[PDB]
Amino acid sequence: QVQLQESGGGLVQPGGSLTLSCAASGFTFSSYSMYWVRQAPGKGLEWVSSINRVGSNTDYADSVKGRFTISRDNAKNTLYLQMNSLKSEDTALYYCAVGMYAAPPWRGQGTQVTVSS
Ligand SMILES: [Cl-]
């Protein structure tokens, strides 16, 4: 079946880093642009980052620009998000998805990141 599995979340103090991974299976990963989106209580769903099919073009929400980096491995069918200089406001459940607004199975079940003093 179509599966997207996020991992790499954790609890970390502000200023710290994390790297999220998303293992894709059950479809041709290379045929899809990929997205990181995040949801946190009271803030709804907000887009974080996107990458085209081969990684030659990437985009970032304004709030994470210069701090986060999206990348993909089309051999391993894996999506990544390296996060630096984490803030409180980055606390959220992070999902990877084939679209900004995709729903399961085309969005994963998420990985929690909690940035707390
Ligand atoms: Cl909410």
Residue numbers in the entry: 1 to 117
Question: Can you provide the manuscript's text about this entry?
Answer:
The classical PCs cleave after basic residue motifs, with furin preferentially recognising the motif R-X-K/R-R↓ (where “↓” represents the scissile peptide bond).
To investigate the effect of furin binding on the structure of the antibody, we also solved the structure of Nb14 in its free state.
